[PDB]
Amino acid sequence: MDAFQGILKFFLNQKTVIGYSFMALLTVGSERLFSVVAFKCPCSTENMTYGLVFLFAPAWVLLILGFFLNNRSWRLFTGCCVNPRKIFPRGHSCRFFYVLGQITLSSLVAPVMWLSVALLNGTFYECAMSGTRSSGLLELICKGKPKECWEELHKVSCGKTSMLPTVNEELKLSLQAQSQILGWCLICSASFFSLLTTCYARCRSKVSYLQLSFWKTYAQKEKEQLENTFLDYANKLSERNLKCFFENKRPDPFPMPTFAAWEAASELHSFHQSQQHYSTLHRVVDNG
Amino acid sequence: MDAFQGILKFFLNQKTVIGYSFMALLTVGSERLFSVVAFKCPCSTENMTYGLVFLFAPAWVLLILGFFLNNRSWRLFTGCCVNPRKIFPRGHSCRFFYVLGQITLSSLVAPVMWLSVALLNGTFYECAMSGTRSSGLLELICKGKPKECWEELHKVSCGKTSMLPTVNEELKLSLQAQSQILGWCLICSASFFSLLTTCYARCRSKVSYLQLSFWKTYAQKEKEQLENTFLDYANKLSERNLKCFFENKRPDPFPMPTFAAWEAASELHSFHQSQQHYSTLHRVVDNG
Amino acid sequence: MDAFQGILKFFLNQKTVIGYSFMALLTVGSERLFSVVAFKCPCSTENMTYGLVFLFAPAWVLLILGFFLNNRSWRLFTGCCVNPRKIFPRGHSCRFFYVLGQITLSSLVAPVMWLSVALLNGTFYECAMSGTRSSGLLELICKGKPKECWEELHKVSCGKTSMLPTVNEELKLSLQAQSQILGWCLICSASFFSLLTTCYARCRSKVSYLQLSFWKTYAQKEKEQLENTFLDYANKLSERNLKCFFENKRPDPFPMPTFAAWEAASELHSFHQSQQHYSTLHRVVDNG
Amino acid sequence: MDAFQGILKFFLNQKTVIGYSFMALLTVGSERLFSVVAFKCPCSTENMTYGLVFLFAPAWVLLILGFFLNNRSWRLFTGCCVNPRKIFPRGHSCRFFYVLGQITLSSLVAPVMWLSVALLNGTFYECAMSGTRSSGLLELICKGKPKECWEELHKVSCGKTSMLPTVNEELKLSLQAQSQILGWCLICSASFFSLLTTCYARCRSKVSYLQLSFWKTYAQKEKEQLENTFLDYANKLSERNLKCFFENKRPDPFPMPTFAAWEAASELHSFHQSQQHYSTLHRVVDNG
């Protein structure tokens, strides 16, 4: 009765680590569906373009999908060209780049998680590195191999190469291991950069830990109370407009906030410790 | 009791991304039914027409089906020839093309999702590119092949070609990889164009984010309250007409809105920030 | 309790697209039962008649079945020869052809859906095109074939033809692909004609979108209220007639509408915007 | 609770098309039991009689079974020889043939549905057409066959014929396809005749669509109210007769309708628009 409610406190408080763990399980299961069912490397001069598109084109699609599902990217830009100075204010002219950096860094998580699982399953790199045709990086792969390594390297994936197939089986192990080292150098350097920018944003905060915990509680249910006020004032307005249409009556006046009050409550909020307001709707009510 | 109600808030708020994800799962499962069960490429001079019809004719059918299921295409055109100046108003003469651009762009989503899954499963392009018979684009496919590649290329799908079947197996890999590169160039450029026009429509909006959130709440249940008023005034009218038919009585008068009020409430709505009305039914009640 | 009621709103509002999707699933499953279990092509001079009857005779039966199940075809014709001028009125003498065009076009949907699934499964066309015996259209099928293609083409379905069975297997692929191109040319041109006549009927309507939505709500439950009035006046009439038969009594009079009022309420309804009546029963009550 | 009641309206309104679809499913499943388990063609001079009895004798039995289960054939004939002029009235002397045509045409549906499924499964026609022994119709089957087709055709079903069994396998395909063409010519011409006589009976009706819908509602529950009056007056009569037998009492009189009133209420009903009566029991109560 209340024991199951006691463990739903544990699955709602740690909700930012279940969401990032369900994103990793979807990225792993989607890469194994592309490499098994759809990917089959040719053995042509189009090896470089074919393997480098299966690596970077699903990363470009996941980046654009992060801009659609980000709710604070639409709060920033909706109605921008009416007056752009409400997004570029006079006191804090560089807060627009701080907010825009947060949308960009938050939507760069699922692209990086794609590039790491695709490099730890080294089939896309093996196809792309075969057709390299470069002066450097070709002596490193073919070091103690016969002389037909510099011409027929791009056929090592499909088989069907006349250079003694115990040599072909160890050229597919030297390329499958170069990709898995790059897959760990990307996980290790993106985890360190992610902690270094989160720790810098908290160390440079204007409030301490206890006031920031109240600020997050207020902003969470200013959103819930705003959905119930919109849903209450729109039932009273639609009931008024329908009775005066069918009965041909003149309506009683309906008081709504003006246009200057709607646009002032939609600005960008920056904290000031002299007068502590926790939203921009809190600020226009207290100041008038 | 209320825990399952708490997660139906999560499956009703994100309803525009479950609908677009269920459309992609139906398009993938329908392309695998056509390519496995029905598609079998001939090896004739009709290769070009056969493969290019299985690509573009299910895209033409899905485009017409998007015009039928679009509710705002019927609100725009019903009763057009009575007076066309209610669709071409005097102040905003170019809003008719802005609305018509929204029906066209919204119904172009399922055609593009068909053309991408059909190109990532490269059977329709392999049949169509075989019978090309062009001066260009035929030297690119047959580069280091024997001289019977320029005459018997259209038989490479069915087998039964006398050009050493290790050469036929790598002409089917060079065409199956050219189609999968075009399948990713279409997903990447349609995702970028879809974000560029949505961001331009929000940046050029007349209202800010908070007033647009109230406008969407009002328009959603002006539709629910209109279905309950129509259902209430049609029960009272059918009860009146049936008692005066069987009993041979003369009826009491039933007040309804006139024809000039029905047609004025069906016009096209454009926001004005001087007098803020949230529908065209709100405007004819307040103005008279 | 009310959550399942909330999704039955979604399965009752979109009821005209579940009915047309269940008709397509029955037509596909019925064509696979005829082509697998019953159809087996002979190899005689009766190839043309045998395959062209399995194509067009189930389309003729589905057209006649659409006239039986159309409720508005019986409302138009019942009691026609009593006075034909109630179906050919004086003001609108061409509305009879507009209504008769709607019964004909609505019952032509299941014949066209039969002819498309039968042509996309190319067994009926392969049997019928084999026995063509025409000067044209026989050189197009036999282009680079031996000279026994002009005489023994009608045996290519059954096998047992002495023209090198790798040639017989590619004459069955050139005919199975000509039928699937015609199956897509019929789906594409019937979808475009279906949208062009629906859009012309809405653009030429006498009322706008909002008045047409009330008109459909009234006509739906004038039918429900008429079934409850007939069921109420027939219980009171059968109770009266049975008590005066067994007890040998004389009955009290039972007031019913006259014959001139029954026939005037059964005419064909055309909207007029000067006096807006939503049925022909609404018109004879208000006018007398 | 009421949702399942809402769909039983759909399975009771369309009750005349579920009954005709369950008759077709029983006729198909009964023909496959006769042709698989019981039918085995001899190869004698009795081929013509054996196959033509399995075709027409189950059609004769299904026709007689339609006269037993027709309730309006017993209402017409019961008590005929008491006075035949109540079935041959003076004003409408040709209504007796119109009613008798309705019993005959309604009971001719299951015979025609037997003859069509038996001809679409061409085993009964193949046995019967083999032993034809006619001057015509024997040159059409044996056109380009050896000379032992005119003498040993009746053995082609059982096998065991010395005319090169690739010729016997294509004489069994030319007869199995002649029967399936006749099976579609019977379905197509009986569907067209069934619509042509129903449309002529409705176009020549005395009442319009709305008065005919009330007439069908009254006749349906004059039958239900008559079963409850018979069941109520027979409980009161059997209680009276049993108390006066065991107690040796004299009974109180029980008023019943006379013999002239029982026979007048059992006549044949024809509508008159001058005095509109909806049954013959309605007419003898109002007229006396």
Numbering used by the authors:
A (entry chain A), B (entry chain K), C (entry chain J), D (entry chain I): 1 to 288
Sentences from the paper on this structure:
To further investigate the CALHM channels, we purified human CALHM5 and determined its structure by cryo-electron microscopy (cryo-EM). CALHM5 assembles as an undecamer, showing an overall truncated cone-shaped architecture, with approximate dimensions of 95 Å in height spanning the cell membrane, 125 Å in extracellular width, and 145 Å in intracellular width. Each subunit consists of a large transmembrane domain (TMD) that comprises four transmembrane helices TM1–4 and an N-terminal helix (NTH), an intracellular C-terminal domain (CTD) consisting of three α-helices CH1–3 and an extracellular loop region. CALHM5 exhibits an unusually large pore along the symmetric axis which is broad at both entrances with a measured diameter of ~60 Å and is slightly narrowed down at constriction.
We observed extra amorphous density in the middle of the CALHM5 channel and five lipid-like densities per CALHM5 monomer annotated as PA1–5. PA1 is oriented upwards, with headgroups toward positively charged residues at the short extracellular loop. Interestingly, we noticed that these residues are not conserved among CALHMs and some of them, such as Asn121 and Arg32 (Arg124 and Glu37 in CALHM2), are also involved in RUR binding in CALHM2.
